[PDB]
Amino acid sequence: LLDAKASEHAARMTAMKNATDNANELIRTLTLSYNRARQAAITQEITEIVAGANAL
Amino acid sequence: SDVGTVIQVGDGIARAHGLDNVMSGELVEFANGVMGMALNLEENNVGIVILGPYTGIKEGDEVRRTGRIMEVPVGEALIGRVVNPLGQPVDGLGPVETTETRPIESRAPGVMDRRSVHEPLQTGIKAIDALVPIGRGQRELIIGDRQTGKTSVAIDTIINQKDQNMISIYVAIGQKESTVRTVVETLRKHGALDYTIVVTASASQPAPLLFLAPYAGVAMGEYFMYKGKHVLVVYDDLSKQAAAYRELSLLLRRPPGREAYPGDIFYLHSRLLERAAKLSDAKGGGSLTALPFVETQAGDISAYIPTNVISITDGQIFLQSDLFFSGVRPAINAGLSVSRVGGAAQIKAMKKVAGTLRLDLAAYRELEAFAQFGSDLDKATQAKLARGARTVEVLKQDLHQPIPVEKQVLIIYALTRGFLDDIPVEDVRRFEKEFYLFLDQNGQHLLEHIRTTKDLPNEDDLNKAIEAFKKTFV
Amino acid sequence: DVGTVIQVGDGIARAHGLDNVMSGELVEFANGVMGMALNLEENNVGIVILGPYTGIKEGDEVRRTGRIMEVPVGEALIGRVVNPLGQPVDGLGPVETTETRPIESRAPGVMDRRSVHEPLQTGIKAIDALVPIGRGQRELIIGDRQTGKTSVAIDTIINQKDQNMISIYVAIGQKESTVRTVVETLRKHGALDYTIVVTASASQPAPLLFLAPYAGVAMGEYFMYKGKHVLVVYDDLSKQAAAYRELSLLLRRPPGREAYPGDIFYLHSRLLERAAKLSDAKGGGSLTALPFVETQAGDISAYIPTNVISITDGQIFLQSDLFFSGVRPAINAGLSVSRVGGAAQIKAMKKVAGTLRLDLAAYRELEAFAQFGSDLDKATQAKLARGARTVEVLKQDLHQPIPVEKQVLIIYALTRGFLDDIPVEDVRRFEKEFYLFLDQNGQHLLEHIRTTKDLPNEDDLNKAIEAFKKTFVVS
Amino acid sequence: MTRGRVIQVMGPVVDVKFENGHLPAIYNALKIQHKARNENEVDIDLTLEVALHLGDDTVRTIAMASTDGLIRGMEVIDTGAPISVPVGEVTLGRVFNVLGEPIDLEGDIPADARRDPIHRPAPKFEELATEVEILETGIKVVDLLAPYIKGGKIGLFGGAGVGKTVLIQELIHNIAQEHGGISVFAGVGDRTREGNDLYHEMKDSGVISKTAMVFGQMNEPPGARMRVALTGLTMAEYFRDEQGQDVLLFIDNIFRFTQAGSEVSALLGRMPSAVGYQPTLATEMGQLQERITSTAKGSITSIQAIYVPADDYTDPAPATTFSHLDATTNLERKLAEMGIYPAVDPLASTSRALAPEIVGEEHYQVARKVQQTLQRYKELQDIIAILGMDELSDEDKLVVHRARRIQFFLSQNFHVAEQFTGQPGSYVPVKETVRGFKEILEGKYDHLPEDAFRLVGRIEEVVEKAKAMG
Amino acid sequence: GLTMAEYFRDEQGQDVLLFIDNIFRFTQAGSEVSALLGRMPSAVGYQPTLATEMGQLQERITSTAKGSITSIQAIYVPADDYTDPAPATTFSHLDATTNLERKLAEMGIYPAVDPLASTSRALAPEIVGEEHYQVARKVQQTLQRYKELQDIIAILGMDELSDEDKLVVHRARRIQFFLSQNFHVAEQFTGQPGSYVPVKETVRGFKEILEGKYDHLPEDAFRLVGRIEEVVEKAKAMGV
Amino acid sequence: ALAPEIVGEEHYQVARKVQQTLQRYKELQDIIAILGMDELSDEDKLVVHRARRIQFFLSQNFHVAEQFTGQPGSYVPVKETVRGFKEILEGKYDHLPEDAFRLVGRIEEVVEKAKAMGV
Numbered sequence A: 001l002l003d004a005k006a007s008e009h010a011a012r013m014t015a016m017k018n019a020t021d022n023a024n025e026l027i028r029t030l031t032l033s034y035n036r037a038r039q040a041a042i043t044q045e046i047t048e049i050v051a052g053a054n055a056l
Numbered sequence B: 001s002d003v004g005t006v007i008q009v010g011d012g013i014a015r016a017h018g019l020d021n022v023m024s025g026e027l028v029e030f031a032n033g034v035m036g037m038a039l040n041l042e043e044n045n046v047g048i049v050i051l052g053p054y055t056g057i058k059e060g061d062e063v064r065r066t067g068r069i070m071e072v073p074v075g076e077a078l079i080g081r082v083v084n085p086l087g088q089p090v091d092g093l094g095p096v097e098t099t100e101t102r103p104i105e106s107r108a109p110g111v112m113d114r115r116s117v118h119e120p121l122q123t124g125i126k127a128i129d130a131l132v133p134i135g136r137g138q139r140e141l142i143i144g145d146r147q148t149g150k151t152s153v154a155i156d157t158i159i160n161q162k163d164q165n166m167i168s169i170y171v172a173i174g175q176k177e178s179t180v181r182t183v184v185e186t187l188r189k190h191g192a193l194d195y196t197i198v199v200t201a202s203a204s205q206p207a208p209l210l211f212l213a214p215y216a217g218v219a220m221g222e223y224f225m226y227k228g229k230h231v232l233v234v235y236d237d238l239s240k241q242a243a244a245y246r247e248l249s250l251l252l253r254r255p256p257g258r259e260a261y262p263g264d265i266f267y268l269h270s271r272l273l274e275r276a277a278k279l280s281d282a283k284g285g286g287s288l289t290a291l292p293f294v295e296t297q298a299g300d301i302s303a304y305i306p307t308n309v310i311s312i313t314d315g316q317i318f319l320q321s322d323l324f325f326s327g328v329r330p331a332i333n334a335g336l337s338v339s340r341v342g343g344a345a346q347i348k349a350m351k352k353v354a355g356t357l358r359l360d361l362a363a364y365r366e367l368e369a370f371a372q373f374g375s376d377l378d379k380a381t382q383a384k385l386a387r388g389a390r391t392v393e394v395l396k397q398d399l400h401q402p403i404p405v406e407k408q409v410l411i412i413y414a415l416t417r418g419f420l421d422d423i424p425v426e427d428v429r430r431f432e433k434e435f436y437l438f439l440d441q442n443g444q445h446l447l448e449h450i451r452t453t454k455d456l457p458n459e460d461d462l463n464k465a466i467e468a469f470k471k472t473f474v
Numbered sequence C: 001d002v003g004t005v006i007q008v009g010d011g012i013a014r015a016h017g018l019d020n021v022m023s024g025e026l027v028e029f030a031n032g033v034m035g036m037a038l039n040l041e042e043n044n045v046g047i048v049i050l051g052p053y054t055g056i057k058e059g060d061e062v063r064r065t066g067r068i069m070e071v072p073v074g075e076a077l078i079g080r081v082v083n084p085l086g087q088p089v090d091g092l093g094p095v096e097t098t099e100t101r102p103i104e105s106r107a108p109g110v111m112d113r114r115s116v117h118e119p120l121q122t123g124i125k126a127i128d129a130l131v132p133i134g135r136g137q138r139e140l141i142i143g144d145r146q147t148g149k150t151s152v153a154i155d156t157i158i159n160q161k162d163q164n165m166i167s168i169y170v171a172i173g174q175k176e177s178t179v180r181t182v183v184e185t186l187r188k189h190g191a192l193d194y195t196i197v198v199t200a201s202a203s204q205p206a207p208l209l210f211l212a213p214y215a216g217v218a219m220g221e222y223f224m225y226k227g228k229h230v231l232v233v234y235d236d237l238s239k240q241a242a243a244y245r246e247l248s249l250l251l252r253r254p255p256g257r258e259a260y261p262g263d264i265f266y267l268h269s270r271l272l273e274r275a276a277k278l279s280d281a282k283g284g285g286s287l288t289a290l291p292f293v294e295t296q297a298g299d300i301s302a303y304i305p306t307n308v309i310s311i312t313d314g315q316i317f318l319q320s321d322l323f324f325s326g327v328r329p330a331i332n333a334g335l336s337v338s339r340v341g342g343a344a345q346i347k348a349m350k351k352v353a354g355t356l357r358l359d360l361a362a363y364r365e366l367e368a369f370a371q372f373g374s375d376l377d378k379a380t381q382a383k384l385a386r387g388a389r390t391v392e393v394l395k396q397d398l399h400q401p402i403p404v405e406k407q408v409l410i411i412y413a414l415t416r417g418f419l420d421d422i423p424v425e426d427v428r429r430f431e432k433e434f435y436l437f438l439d440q441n442g443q444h445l446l447e448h449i450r451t452t453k454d455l456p457n458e459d460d461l462n463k464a465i466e467a468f469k470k471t472f473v474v475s
Numbered sequence D: 001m002t003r004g005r006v007i008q009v010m011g012p013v014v015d016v017k018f019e020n021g022h023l024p025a026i027y028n029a030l031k032i033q034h035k036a037r038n039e040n041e042v043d044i045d046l047t048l049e050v051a052l053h054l055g056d057d058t059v060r061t062i063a064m065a066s067t068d069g070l071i072r073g074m075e076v077i078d079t080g081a082p083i084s085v086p087v088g089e090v091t092l093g094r095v096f097n098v099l100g101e102p103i104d105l106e107g108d109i110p111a112d113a114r115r116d117p118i119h120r121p122a123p124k125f126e127e128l129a130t131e132v133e134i135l136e137t138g139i140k141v142v143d144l145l146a147p148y149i150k151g152g153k154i155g156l157f158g159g160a161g162v163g164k165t166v167l168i169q170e171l172i173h174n175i176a177q178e179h180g181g182i183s184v185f186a187g188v189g190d191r192t193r194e195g196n197d198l199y200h201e202m203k204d205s206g207v208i209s210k211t212a213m214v215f216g217q218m219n220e221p222p223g224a225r226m227r228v229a230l231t232g233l234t235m236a237e238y239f240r241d242e243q244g245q246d247v248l249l250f251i252d253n254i255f256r257f258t259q260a261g262s263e264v265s266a267l268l269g270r271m272p273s274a275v276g277y278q279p280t281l282a283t284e285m286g287q288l289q290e291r292i293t294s295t296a297k298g299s300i301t302s303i304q305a306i307y308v309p310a311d312d313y314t315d316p317a318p319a320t321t322f323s324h325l326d327a328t329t330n331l332e333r334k335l336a337e338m339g340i341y342p343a344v345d346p347l348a349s350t351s352r353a354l355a356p357e358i359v360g361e362e363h364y365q366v367a368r369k370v371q372q373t374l375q376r377y378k379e380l381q382d383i384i385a386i387l388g389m390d391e392l393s394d395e396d397k398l399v400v401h402r403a404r405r406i407q408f409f410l411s412q413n414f415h416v417a418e419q420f421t422g423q424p425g426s427y428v429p430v431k432e433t434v435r436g437f438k439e440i441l442e443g444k445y446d447h448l449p450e451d452a453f454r455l456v457g458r459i460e461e462v463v464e465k466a467k468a469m470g
Numbered sequence E: 001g002l003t004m005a006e007y008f009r010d011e012q013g014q015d016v017l018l019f020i021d022n023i024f025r026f027t028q029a030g031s032e033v034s035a036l037l038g039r040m041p042s043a044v045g046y047q048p049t050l051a052t053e054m055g056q057l058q059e060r061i062t063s064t065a066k067g068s069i070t071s072i073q074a075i076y077v078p079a080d081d082y083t084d085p086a087p088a089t090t091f092s093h094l095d096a097t098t099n100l101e102r103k104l105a106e107m108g109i110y111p112a113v114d115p116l117a118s119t120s121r122a123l124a125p126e127i128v129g130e131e132h133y134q135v136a137r138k139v140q141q142t143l144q145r146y147k148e149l150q151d152i153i154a155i156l157g158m159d160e161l162s163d164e165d166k167l168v169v170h171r172a173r174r175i176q177f178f179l180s181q182n183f184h185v186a187e188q189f190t191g192q193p194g195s196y197v198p199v200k201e202t203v204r205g206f207k208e209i210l211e212g213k214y215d216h217l218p219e220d221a222f223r224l225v226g227r228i229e230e231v232v233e234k235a236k237a238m239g240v
Numbered sequence F: 001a002l003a004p005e006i007v008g009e010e011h012y013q014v015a016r017k018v019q020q021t022l023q024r025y026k027e028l029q030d031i032i033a034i035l036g037m038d039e040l041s042d043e044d045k046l047v048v049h050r051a052r053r054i055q056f057f058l059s060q061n062f063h064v065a066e067q068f069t070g071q072p073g074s075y076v077p078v079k080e081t082v083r084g085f086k087e088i089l090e091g092k093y094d095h096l097p098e099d100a101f102r103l104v105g106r107i108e109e110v111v112e113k114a115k116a117m118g119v
C-alpha cells in the first residue's frame, strides 16, 4: 500500500503536467487563428463599404 | 452677398448655392426659422446641416447668414432647468433668461496653465473611492455593455457631492425621453436639482443635435470653471454621438474608413475630452472633470470607437456582465480598471489604509481561480483565500445609497487589519451597516478627527474601539 | 514626343500628351529623374516615377528616352555596388557598361531546356545531405524574422569561390546598415572580386523596389546565354509583394484577399520562371535562384508563403524555436523538400546519405512521444542514440564551409555506427579532430573522392576510421 | 512672390488655386495670416502643408491647426520651402511645437536662428559606418543582458507605475555627463496633463539643461501629430552632423505616428488596405527610421515606446515597426513591487548585439549563465509557492541563493533618484559589471548578507556595505 | 397602425394595446430604396439614416398624461447576430425585453427564452416585492454558474467535481426545464391542451426547487408543464 | 457510384462501414488532443485502435514515387482492396503493429513487413 499510494499520486502528477502543457500549446495555436480571422473580417467590411461608395 | 438659395434638401443635409462669405462653423437661418450649421464648402455649393425639423424647407427657399460662430448661451439662470443643446428651454417653465454666450469650438487650456491633480472627488461608492481614484481634473472612462450598471454609477456620484462645494452637469445623449424624465425625477426627490443642469438630446431629434449635445454641455461648464468653482460633467453615451457624426457625414459624401466612421473621429472625441483640466493658481484654481460613457458590443475592447476612448482618458473602469449576475454589485473588474494619476486624489488616511487592499485582491484573483475546490491544503493558502472572499463582500454596495469617506476608511482598516477574520463571509453585508451604528453612538472622537485632519488617529485607540465592538457582536 | 504632367500624387502620376507611347517605356523628367510608362488612356499617359518626385510640378516636362525598359549589362559591373537603374552607388565613378537588355524578357521554353545533373554545393551539411540544390533548381528559403535566412546565402556565395560561378545578391527592403556591412564582409573573405550587389533599401520610392528583383535576373541572364553558370538571391519577395500592393492601390486597381491584387501570382512567376538550365544547343549555361520569404507567426500556411511554395522546385523551412534552442542553422526536415533533388547529388553522397533523412525525420518526431512516454523498447532506445548524433552532426558555425569530400566522410562514419562510440558533447571535437586527421594523414581517401566522384575502398575507409578512433580520446 | 487663394474646405483638408500656374512643391508649407474686415469675420493665423497636385492648377493641403472661421476667398502665401525649425544651442532647455514656435513662456527665439527643413533626403551608403559599436549606458541590467547598439532602435514595452520617466531621465543624465551628448524628447500624442508633469519633473531633476523637447498634443489635427517626430529628428541631425557628438532621441508612442498617417490617408481619400491602415505603411515608417543611423562623424540612437494594437504582434502596425528595432526592454510591474529599480525583466529582454563577435566571448558567457541561473530559479518559484525551501534538493537551493543575489545586484542606485532619497548614486563601466558578475558566478562573495546587494554599484561596494551592518 | 392607436389614446381617452409584427422589416425596406435614392452605403449594407428613422417611429409610441399605449413588438435578429446595427439600435428604446435563442429551441425547451439576457426595468425590490426579487436573482446565479461549469464537464467529465458543483448541476437542469410551458397555441403543435399559472404560484414553486424539496423526482417531468402540482402527478405515471 | 446497384452490395456494406469508424475518430480528435487515451473507455479504445489501422492501410507505394523514395510500386486490384478492408474491420489482424501498415500494396505485404520488425 505505501508503494501503491506513492506511485499513484506520482502518476497523477505526471499526467497533469503533460495535460497542462498540451492545453497551453493549444491556446497559442487557437489564439493565432482568432487574430487571423479578426484581421480578415475587418478587411472584408471595409471593401464592401468602399465598393458601394465607388459605385455611387 | 449674404443671401443664398437651397438646391438639394434631404435627410437633414440641405446643400445650398451662393452664401459666398460663409465660414466653416457659422450659423445660417432659413426662412422657416430653423437654423443650420455650414460644415462643407465645395467649389460651387455650401453644405448645410439642419439643426431642426426639415419638413418645411423646400428647394429655392432663401437661407440667410446669422453672422456669428456657433454659440451656446451661458449664465447662472440655467441651473435647475431642462434645456436643449441649443439654448432653448424644454421643461416648460418659460425662458432660461441667460446673459451671454460662448463658442462651442473653444481651445483647450494649454501646458504651463495646468497643475498636478492634487485633490479628491468622493463618489461614495466603496470600490470607486478605494480602488480606482478620480481626482479633480482627471478624465475617467466608464466602459461596459448594455444592462450592466453604468447610469447608476454616475447618478450616485452627483448625490454624494451634495455637501461638497461642487457644480455637476448631466448630458443625456440618444436616450428615450421617458428615461430622461425618470432620471430628472429621481434627482429632484433627492434634492439634487437645485445645483445641477440636465442637457437633453432625445432619439427623435436630427442627428446633428446629438453631435452638438456633448459640446454644448462642456461649453456650459467651462464658464463656471474659468470663474473659479469646480465642475463635473457626465456624457451618457459617446458611442451615440459617434454614430450621429457618421450619419451627418455619410450624407454629405465625405470619404469613409474602418467601420465607416469618417477620418475626423479621433479629432472630434479628443477635443471634447481634453477641455478638462485643473487650472493653476494664476487662472484661479478652477477645475473641470469628465466622465465619458462607452457601450461595447460583446465586450469588443478592440472596436474603432472603443480603442479610441480608452486612449484619450487618464484611466478606465471596465464593468463585466457575469460579475453582476454573480452578486458582485457594482460589477467592477479590478484587473482591467486602471488609474494613471492614482495616488494623489485620496485623503492621507485612505492612502495609508488602502495600499494592502489592491495587493490582497490580486492574490485572490490568481489563487482562487485554481484552488477553490482543494480545501485540505497548506494553511497559508487557506488563510489567503478567506481575505479575498471577505474583501469581495466589503466591496459590495446597494443602489442609490452613498457612503461618506470617514466610514469607508474605518471598514477598510478593519478588513486590512483583519479584525474581520472571526466573522463568517456571509453576514459581512449586514455587519458592515451595523459596525456603522456602534461607531455613531459611541465613537464620535475617532470620526471627529478624521474629517478635520484627513489623517488617522492613534493606533491604540482604534484597536481598543474595534476590539471592544468585536466583543459586543454576536 | 514631348508632353506635360497634370496630376502628381503619391508616386503615381499622369501626363497629357505623349500620343504614341509604348507600354513599358522609359521617360525622363526635366529634373533628370526617370519614370516608367505603364498605361495609355485616350488623352493621358499614366507614368510611375523612379526617383525623387519633389521637383515634379503640374505643367512640368517629361520626354521620351526612345528605349524599352532597359538595364545596362557588361563585365564592368562585377565588383561594383549599383542601383536598380544602371547607376553606380559605391562612389568609385562610372560603371562603364557596353550594352543593354530588356527587363521584360521571355523565359526559356520547353525543348529549349534540359534536365539538371550538376550540383550546387553549399558547404552546409544539412542542405547538401538532406535537401539538395542542383544548378538550376528553384528553391525558397522561408522562415520567421531573425532565423538566419541571410546567413545561409552568404555561406553559399563564399563557398562558390572555388567553383567557376557568378553570384548576384539582390537586397529588397533591407536596412541600409545591414547591406553596407555585408559588402565589407564579402570584401574581407575576398568574395567581391566575382559578384554584383544590387540595392533597393526601405527609404526609396516603391517603384524601384518592384523593378529590383527583375533587374537582378536581367544582369544574370546576359552571362547565362553566354555559357557561364550564375546564381541569384532575392532577400525578401514578401516585401516586393507589399510594394506592388501600394502601387496598385494608388493606381486604384481593384482589391483582392488581404489586399493583394490578382497579379501577385503573375508578378512572382514572371521573375522565377526565367531561371533555366539551358541545353547543349544553347551552350549549356544556367541561371539558378534562391528567393526568401518571411512568414508571420512562423506558420507555413498563409497567402504569399503558399504562392511562392507553388512556383519553386522545393522549399527550405527554418524554425525560430529550433534556432532559440541554439541549433544553427535550424532546418525542419519534415516541411522541407527538394523536387528536382536526387539527380543533383554526387555519386558518393547518393550512396552515403539517401538514408540520413530516415534517421532525422524519424528522430525529430520520436523525441516528442518519448519525453511524455512512460516506456521505451530497446529498438526505440537505439533509434534515439543514432538520431542524437545526427542533430549534433548537422550543427555548424557561421562563415565556416566544409568541402564536399569531407562531408561524405563524416556522414559515412555516423551512418556506419563507429561514431556512436563518441559521447554527444565530444562529437563536435571529433568532427574538427577528424577533418585535421584527414588533412595530415589520410590524403589517399581525399584524392579518390574528388577525382572519381565516388566512395573509396570501404575496407580502407573502415581500417582508416578505426585507426582514427584509436588516436582520439574522450572527456 | 506668388500668393494663392482657398477654394474648398472640409474639416482638416483645404484646396488652394494658384492661377498663374507657378505652384508649390509636394511638402512645402503655406501661411494664412488675415485681419478681420468686418465684425462678422474672425481673424485667422493658420498654416498648411502641401499633399497632392490634383490638376487644373489646384493643390490639396492638410492643415496644422483648427480650420474654423475660414472664408473661401481667403488669401494664402507660400514660404518656398518645407516647415523649418531652429537648430543650435538656442534650443537646449526650451519646449517647442511642430511649427518651431516656443510654447514655454521663456521669450521668443530670434529671426537669426538657422532654420533647417523637416523633410530631407535620407543618408547615403557611402556615408555610413562599417563596424558595430556598443554604447555604454552606465546601467547594469541594460549593458549586461541586453546591450544597446549605437545607431540602434530600442523598444520600450511598458505602462504606468513601472516608471518610464525615471529611466529616460537617468539615461539623459548618464550620456550627457560621461559621453558628452545631448537628448531630444518628442512626445507624439502626449496627454496634456502629462506634458505639464514632465516639464516640472525635467526641471526639478536638473536634467532640463541638456535636453530639447517637442510636444504635439492630442487635440491637434492629424497632420500635426504625424510631422511631430520629423521635427524632433531634424533637431538631432544638427548635433551629429556639426557638433559631431552622439545624440539620443526619445519618441513617446510610435503607434500614434502610424495612426495619424491612417487618418490623413482617409481624409485625403486613399483606399484602405490590410486591417484599415494606410496603403503606404512601410514607405512612411521606413522614411523615418532610416534617418536614425550611425554615420562616420557620429550617431543617433533612439528609445521608442510601442503599444501592440490588440496583443497581436502579427497586426500590420507592429510587424513594420519590429522590422527596424535592434533591442527590446520590457518593464514589468511585479518587480517594481519587490524593490528592484530599474524594473527590467532579464528573461523577456533581448538584443541582436548579445553575440560573441559584437560583445566579445567573456561578456557573452557571463550573460548566458545569468539567464540560465534565473530560468531555473523561476521553475523553483512555483514549487516554493506550494512548499518550503528545505524540501528542494541542495542543487536547487544553490540556484535560489545565487539567483536572489543576482536579481538584487542587477538593481542600482540612480543619480536622478537623489532628490527623493539621500543616497547619492553611481555609474558602472561595462568592464566592471562583467568582472563583478564573474566573481558572483564563481561564488567568491557568497559569505555575505542578502540585502548587501540591494541598490549598489561596483562589487567592492558590497564588501564595504557589508561591514556597515557589521 | 400608429395613427389609429393615437386617435384612441388622445381624443377618446381609453387605454390601448398596440401589436406590431416584425418591425425589422421596416428597417430592411429603407436599405432597398437607399441606393436608388442616391445615398452612400454605411456599415453592413445599411442606410446612412438608421438611428433617425427608428427614433422618429419609436418616440411616437408613448403613454402620455392623457392615456396609455401598452406596446408589444416582434424583432428579427438579422443573421443570428445580436451585434448587428438594427437590433443594437433598437435595444435602447425598450422597457422590457425577451431574447429568444436557437440553442434552447434545439434542446426543445419552449418558449426558448434566455433567462440572463432578458432583463426588465421592473425587476426592482419596490415594484415587485422583496420575496419576488430574492428568488429571481438567486435563480440567475444558479444558471450563470451552470454555464461556466459546462465547459469543465464537456472536456474533463462530471464525476471529477465537488458536491457543491454536483448540486448546482442537479438544480440547474430542473430550473431550466421548469421554465418550459404548455401553451394553448401549442395545442395544435403538441397535443396537450395548455395552462395559465398565476404569479403567486410561480414564486412558491421556484422557491421549492431552490430549497431542494422536489429533487427526488426525475428530471424528465419538468418539460412543457404549468404548475408544480402537475409535475408530481406526471412523475407518478412514469412510476416514481 | 457508391450506390448498392453500381458497385455491388459487398463493396457497399464495406465502404459505408469504413466511413462510420473514421467519422467517430474525428469526434474523438478534440478529446484525445488534451488528456490522451486514459479518459476513453470501452468502445472508444477499440474504435481508436481500428481507426489507426484503417488510416495507414489507405496509403500506397507508387511507381511514380520511385524518383523520391527507393521502394518499388504496387497495383492493388479491386477484389483484393475490398477483401482487405474486411479483415481489418473484423479484427483478424489486431496483433500487428501500426508502423507495418504504411506504404504497402495488397494485405499480405503487411504480414511480411511486420515479420521483418518481429514486433
Ligand SMILES: Nc1ncnc2c1ncn2[C@@H]1O[C@H](COP(=O)(O)OP(=O)(O)OP(=O)(O)O)[C@@H](O)[C@H]1O
Pocket (backbone or CB within 6 Å): B145, B146, B147, B148, B149, B150, B151, B152, B153, B329, B330, B397, B398, B399, E120, E121, E124
Ligand atoms: N448597484 C446596483 N444595485 C442594484 N441594481 C442595480 C445596480 N446597478 C444597476 N442595477 C440595476 O440593473 C440595471 C442597471 O441599469 P443601467 O441604467 O445602469 O443599465 P445600462 O444598460 O448601463 O443603461 P444605459 O443604457 O443608460 O447605459 C437596472 O435594472 C438597475 O435597477
Ligand SMILES: Nc1ncnc2c1ncn2[C@@H]1O[C@H](COP(=O)(O)OP(=O)(O)OP(=O)(O)O)[C@@H](O)[C@H]1O
Pocket (backbone or CB within 6 Å): C144, C145, C146, C147, C148, C149, C150, C151, C328, C329, C396, C397, C398, D352, D355
Ligand atoms: N550558424 C550560426 N552559428 C552562430 N551564429 C549564427 C549562425 N547563423 C547565424 N548566426 C547569428 O545569429 C543571428 C541570426 O540573425 P540573422 O540576421 O543572421 O537572421 P536572418 O534570418 O538572416 O535575419 P533577417 O530576418 O533580417 O533576414 C545573427 O546575430 C547571426 O550573426
Ligand SMILES: [Mg+2]
Pocket (backbone or CB within 6 Å): B150, B151, B152
Ligand atoms: Mg442607464
Ligand SMILES: [Mg+2]
Pocket (backbone or CB within 6 Å): C149, C150, C174, C235
Ligand atoms: Mg536578412
